[PDB]
Enzyme design. Sequence first.
Site, PDB file in Angstrom:
ATOM      1  N   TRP B  41       0.800  -1.214   0.000  1.00 31.17           N
ATOM      2  CA  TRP B  41       0.000   0.000   0.000  1.00 31.17           C
ATOM      3  C   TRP B  41       0.838   1.272   0.000  1.00 31.17           C
ATOM      4  CZ3 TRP B  41      -3.233   1.575   4.905  1.00 31.17           C
ATOM      5  CH2 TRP B  41      -2.462   1.455   6.061  1.00 31.17           C
ATOM      6  N   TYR B  87      16.869  -5.649   5.145  1.00 35.26           N
ATOM      7  CA  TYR B  87      15.524  -5.774   5.695  1.00 35.26           C
ATOM      8  C   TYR B  87      15.251  -7.224   6.063  1.00 35.26           C
ATOM      9  CZ  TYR B  87      10.536  -6.105   6.226  1.00 35.26           C
ATOM     10  OH  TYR B  87       9.279  -6.366   6.705  1.00 35.26           O
ATOM     11  N   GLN B 114      -2.139  -6.840   2.289  1.00 37.02           N
ATOM     12  CA  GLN B 114      -2.166  -5.502   2.877  1.00 37.02           C
ATOM     13  C   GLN B 114      -3.362  -4.744   2.292  1.00 37.02           C
ATOM     14  OE1 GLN B 114       1.382  -3.032   2.553  1.00 37.02           O
ATOM     15  NE2 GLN B 114       1.822  -3.218   4.752  1.00 37.02           N
ATOM     16  N   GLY B 179      -1.327  -3.370   8.253  1.00 37.27           N
ATOM     17  CA  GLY B 179      -0.561  -2.153   8.113  1.00 37.27           C
ATOM     18  C   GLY B 179      -0.261  -1.457   9.418  1.00 37.27           C
ATOM     19  N   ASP B 181       1.301  -2.615  12.610  1.00 40.06           N
ATOM     20  CA  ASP B 181       1.932  -3.839  13.102  1.00 40.06           C
ATOM     21  C   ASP B 181       1.736  -4.030  14.598  1.00 40.06           C
ATOM     22  OD1 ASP B 181       2.788  -3.519  10.504  1.00 40.06           O
ATOM     23  OD2 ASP B 181       4.886  -3.106  11.078  1.00 40.06           O
ATOM     24  N   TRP B 375       2.657   2.498  16.215  1.00 40.16           N
ATOM     25  CA  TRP B 375       1.212   2.670  16.124  1.00 40.16           C
ATOM     26  C   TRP B 375       0.530   2.811  17.478  1.00 40.16           C
ATOM     27  CZ3 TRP B 375      -1.197   3.872  11.763  1.00 40.16           C
ATOM     28  CH2 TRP B 375      -0.540   3.580  10.561  1.00 40.16           C
ATOM     29  N   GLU B 418       8.129   9.200   8.807  1.00 33.61           N
ATOM     30  CA  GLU B 418       7.150   8.129   8.853  1.00 33.61           C
ATOM     31  C   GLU B 418       5.998   8.491   9.773  1.00 33.61           C
ATOM     32  OE1 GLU B 418       9.044   4.428   9.888  1.00 33.61           O
ATOM     33  OE2 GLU B 418       7.279   3.228   9.354  1.00 33.61           O
TER      34      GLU B 418
END
Lengths: 445, 445, 445, 445
Positions: B41, B87, B114, B179, B181, B375, B418
Amino acid sequence: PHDPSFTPTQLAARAAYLLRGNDLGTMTTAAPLLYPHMWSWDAAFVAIGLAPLSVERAVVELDTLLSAQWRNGMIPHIVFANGVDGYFPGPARWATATLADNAPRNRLTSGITQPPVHAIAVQRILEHARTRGRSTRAVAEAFLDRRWGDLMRWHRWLAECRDRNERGRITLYHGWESGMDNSPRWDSAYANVVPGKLPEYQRADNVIITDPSQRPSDGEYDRYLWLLEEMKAVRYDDERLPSVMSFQVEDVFFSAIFSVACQVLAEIGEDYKRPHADVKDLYLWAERFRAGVVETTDQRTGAARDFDVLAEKWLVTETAAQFAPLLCGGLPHDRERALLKLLEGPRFCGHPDLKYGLIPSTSPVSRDFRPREYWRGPVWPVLTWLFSWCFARRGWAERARLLRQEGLRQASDGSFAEYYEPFTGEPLGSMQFSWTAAAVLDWLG
Amino acid sequence: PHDPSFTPTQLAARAAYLLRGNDLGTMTTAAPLLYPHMWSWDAAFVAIGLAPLSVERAVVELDTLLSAQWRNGMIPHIVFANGVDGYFPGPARWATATLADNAPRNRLTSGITQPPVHAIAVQRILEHARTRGRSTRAVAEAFLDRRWGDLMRWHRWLAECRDRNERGRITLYHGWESGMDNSPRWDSAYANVVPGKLPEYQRADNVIITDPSQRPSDGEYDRYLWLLEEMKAVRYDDERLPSVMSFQVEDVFFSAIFSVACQVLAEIGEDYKRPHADVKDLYLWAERFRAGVVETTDQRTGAARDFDVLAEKWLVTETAAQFAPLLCGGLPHDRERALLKLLEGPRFCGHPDLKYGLIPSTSPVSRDFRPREYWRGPVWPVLTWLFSWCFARRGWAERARLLRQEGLRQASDGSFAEYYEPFTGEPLGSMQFSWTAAAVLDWLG
Amino acid sequence: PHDPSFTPTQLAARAAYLLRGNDLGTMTTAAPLLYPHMWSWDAAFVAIGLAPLSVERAVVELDTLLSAQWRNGMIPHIVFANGVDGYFPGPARWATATLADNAPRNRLTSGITQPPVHAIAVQRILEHARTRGRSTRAVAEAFLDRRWGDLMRWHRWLAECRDRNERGRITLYHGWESGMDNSPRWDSAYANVVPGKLPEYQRADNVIITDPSQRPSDGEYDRYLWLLEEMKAVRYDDERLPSVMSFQVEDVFFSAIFSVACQVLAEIGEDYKRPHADVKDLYLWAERFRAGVVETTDQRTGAARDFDVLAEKWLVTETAAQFAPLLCGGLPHDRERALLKLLEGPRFCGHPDLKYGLIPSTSPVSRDFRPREYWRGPVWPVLTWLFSWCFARRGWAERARLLRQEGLRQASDGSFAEYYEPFTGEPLGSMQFSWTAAAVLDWLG
Amino acid sequence: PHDPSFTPTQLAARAAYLLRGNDLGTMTTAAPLLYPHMWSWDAAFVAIGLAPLSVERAVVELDTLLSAQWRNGMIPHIVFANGVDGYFPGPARWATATLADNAPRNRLTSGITQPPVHAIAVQRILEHARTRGRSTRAVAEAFLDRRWGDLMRWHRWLAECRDRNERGRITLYHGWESGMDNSPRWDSAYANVVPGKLPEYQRADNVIITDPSQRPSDGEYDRYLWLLEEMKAVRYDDERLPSVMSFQVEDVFFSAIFSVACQVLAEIGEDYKRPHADVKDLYLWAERFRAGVVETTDQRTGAARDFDVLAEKWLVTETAAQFAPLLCGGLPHDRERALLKLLEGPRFCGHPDLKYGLIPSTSPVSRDFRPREYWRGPVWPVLTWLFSWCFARRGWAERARLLRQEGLRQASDGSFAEYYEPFTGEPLGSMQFSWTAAAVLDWLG
């Protein structure tokens, strides 16, 4: 649509997107296909266009260009990106790696120079840097420590090897060095260049730009390439060129730029406590070339003339280079007012048919004017920017604003063209021209 | 300086310069170092950010993502760029090339999905395309001919394999698929995930982001990786996952997005004369998932709840996902007014200590709130954009404008972070986040 | 709540709304309640403010002011609005109607003068008019025809009756003529002003601005009103003031403004073909007053000094008037660098506690500094605009731009305050101040 | 010369300058000379125009209008400025002061009504007030307390006395009540208006607008003024008009506006806790009039039809009023797509000769079309703003934005014209039109 133009934020975004897309890593090509290498005074403007986006990346552009500097100080007009083709004449024809004693070891370059706008780029980077805080000022200032001596060597080489008689004017050995390749300025000097046994070649520029009316002609290219053979036969030795080159002219526009550049470099050198002797020399050069530009001007109009060294005669043409003294100062009050009236009148910015109130490269009422053909008439954003920025420096705030506003309006279709038809506004030349994108970004600060 | 912020044209230029710098050629990384691959996304929003700059390059972003589509329709959440490291978990741990029957042959992808924002990207590309004239409309329209069937397969797979009982809600088998986590949303479902013999691993994300308070904890990562082992042991077969996965939750935010996406795709399909049966199915799905979102809402506040399939219980948390029904519509008048009062009040946008009137990911008065931790509290431009664009679609013009204006103000330092600390505005997470740059470009149209 | 500031278009609209709201018909009050009449140098800035809105009404503003000019050429500093009270000292206290041989007959005015910024207003009207087409150009050219003779008599009255010894500096007989009523510049001079039998009075200014910390003291007003009695006793006769006035100071800031105004008027005179004798006089005064300003300057910092004619002593204070030579030029290169360094350094614009990078009226490290008290500290948009416009004229494009950008940021709260607290930004003095609105309209363009 | 257009800040400033220049104190004239009094729905847009400038003055504008409300609730379409002439028919011709039982006593007004756009003005004031802080919020909330009862009586008078049979459409007794005086919509109805002994008169409108091609004919005015005599003969009594009026038409555009206005007022009523009975009435009228609009619509295009009550016949014309259902919603999905397609297609916004992508008052392919003649063709900023605001309310963000952007481009010449020639852009009607300035101020924000 009903309107194919962009908003200012859209335009700035597209311009930054072009400059990053023309980035090879350490160098930025002047144009994606037409000019797939680093050109000398394009790299300086690309650095200006990058200074709003990344002071560190703009420092890199200049760092990459000075690493190509010759051992005598000359900044070459092309740094060839390794392994790239599609541009003639490429390094094989120049052969400077083989023949030029002063050519650099780490790079492939051409064998001729180009106007010294690089100091102007340095000041713009500095001005952006001082608004971005402590870490970013350090990046610009470290650049100055790395490259001040190399900037000095660049200006010193122009002052001493290209002004050998201390006349206050820069001598050119190729039209390409003026940045105005096919300008009517050089026609009467190119007419006395007689090509001999010139090795076979094919053009590249007109495989990309396929309209014949936008590029120089085939006869013109044979002469550009012949002067190359002359320089080669003498291994690019400065001391020997005056005795062999069949094209020698003093460029008044180039000289005015150098005057401004020395003054700008001098003031930077004062602000950052550089060696007093370097600053005093820069002020010395700035005044010698200001005076040299003024010595060429017509007594009634202030219009600057170039000088044919071989012919020993003033070259009288009606192009935007007549306005050289407006950039560097030095005219008597009455003569400068006459020069501004020429600029604002129907021979140039006030011609009734111009789509924009910008400066055409050649006067539309000159017999030499061609609306589409490179420097023989078209309007260039490069001249708009340079004239606009120099006018602001003279204190002509409103004139500079009007140029900047007409330039932004012409550029607002997003073509980012090399140059524009003076009457219709048609984008001509290469699209995606780094230099035009950089003018736009600087104008939209 | 006295002001370290940028003008709108400077900001748009820097944003476009970031998006081009994160471009690998055919894909754009979500972030330069933290996320050096294409995320599902993120690629959709990058396409939105690119549509002002180049409709053809934005079409390419989506083209590259659909070429990674699984044989059953699933769009995977990561397309690994070939040869990139830094990653974890990389394609070696996923092993989908070896184990997944539906994995694509030309790409390395993850094994989970996603949220389906891709239709929203398609409409934005279309809207830019119709303002740019005949040649550019053809590029967008050819995209639609190439990929309509693949978009349908994507929506069909969600509707049939992730809503197996036609409950109007999407089932997730990993927190990563939401999205969000480490959202407090999943804490009580992750508490019932019991890792067994999990093969040794080292984290990469926290070698880049070295502050422990901005990323999930080590215990949390062991559970994310254990669910991966469960999926692997069953070769990613859709039919077998419900019987083995120890994490199964219905995501209400994901479901609301899908409802909106189906409606957007349905309207595109009408505008461009797509097969009537596809349009009717899209409207069917749009209403099933709208109704599914509404079935979860608290009768007094309208707040949407997620559902733990294994536990058979509603998950009640105080995060921004409660506002899912505001995106897709469908609440009774009185309940939606209560939901908006929750959004505008001191538990969220009206909390007295917020630097901006933006939506925090978790309510600052929740026991679960952590101002810095991913989040669990931070403000995300991704949520600002999504909520802003969905609000405009509902007809809430002024609410959408206020979100857009606070988002632009938070973004005006050029961090392109971010996420941001809700109280101080401190940029957190990765800098140079493609998605944040794309929100900025879209907001500055 | 989160951000009480206005967008540029909202701000420009509110500025224009204010200026029209302060219009009485043919004159604009300097402020709604505090200054409910036309002030001379305010009216020039209002004209600048109106030029983007209506060239015709900006001409009217100057025509109204010039219709109040005295018969010897003096422009009085107040033209009283018929039947308006609430300001003191009003027409009855000045008694110019009955006492002053040179006063106008259609009008009631004050009996002192104020800085000649009028030439700058004329220039900005003409520049605006030239962008607006033929009808609008005719209006401004006809104003020139009507008023050129009056502008000359204005400059000639200053040059001959206020510089009686051709020293190149303007003599003031009242602090009010300087426009900086209670500046520390005048404290030494005022202490030798001993009032005698001074007729009773009640102040009006501190009924509107009731905070005593923002206005001059009762003791200061007593000296201001006593100087009126001294001029009244001699019927405002120019020939006699040098014999009787207890306050005689040469004002170097006023003098620098005159130097610029003369040069601006002389160039207007050349572009519109005014009498050559006038242009010559204007250039000659430009140079004399440039030289007269430079002659006052500190040998180490370049700071300009006022002069007490009565005491034959230089006045050494730490106010913004020190930077007078930057307005008119003339300093040797090295002392001008020093002066700019003092401007930009920790005693003025670079002082660490300042909210904005703007020029305080008095230096914050001066023993004389007071953050709230009129000209003893606060930041004036008045000064910002004048320095910004003059710097641009000097060619200091980036310096001018930084001043303009900080001015707009301070104005973006929409208060349009007379002056601002230098540390906190708090708006002080009168709100709805016409001059501040005019600066904003001119900066925004 | 090259470009006679204004930047956004110049334009916003000129718009505000105009609105303040048309202010008489407590009312704003709709135009300086042509409409030198307060018009009802103009005054609502002026209030919208003033909300960014002064919430207090925008409240005053609505308070002045509501102070002229009739005793039965009607808001009259003109509130006459005391002692002002130059408009006909003036207060003496209407004779509401002496004849009309319900007329107000502090005021002189007309005797007919106009569309209820007032609820939209109230909404925009409140939205502006909420961004400005507590003092400014109190001002708007106190207005609500003062006037809520008056806004209700306004909507109730429309719903009960102008929709006497609960058909969900508003009956007009004069073309002027529609705000589209000479629209082709009314020609069939007007042809059955046969005037008898009509007292002599001389028009004033075509003394100010002397071009006969921009105003209604002498024949049309004769019918307009005769309808006055019919209402006068019955002393403006609501109960009797249905028996005597030679002109009775149900106006579907007015009706759609009422539907929206009721929904807007009902939501204001909920957010500020007005009486629940009022909110319920408002929602019930919103729905009845939505349904009443939809009931008129063409089964293939969705185009709304007016209705001639006297002849019991639908009026089928090709004007912008066909798009009424797009304002209030209610059409089935498929007919609304058809209606948008008619709006966007070659008969209206997509007509190939149109200078701007804007909505002509009458379709350019209609036999009735006239490019210069008032509502028979020209483009009205009035209509643009209303459609743009309503489209945004529908959730059509991109459609609303394209209307707004074309409106600003047409306004960027600064003429602020009443209406514009659809093909050439020429400004028509009155310049300095308050409503046009208000639209620009609202769009720019």
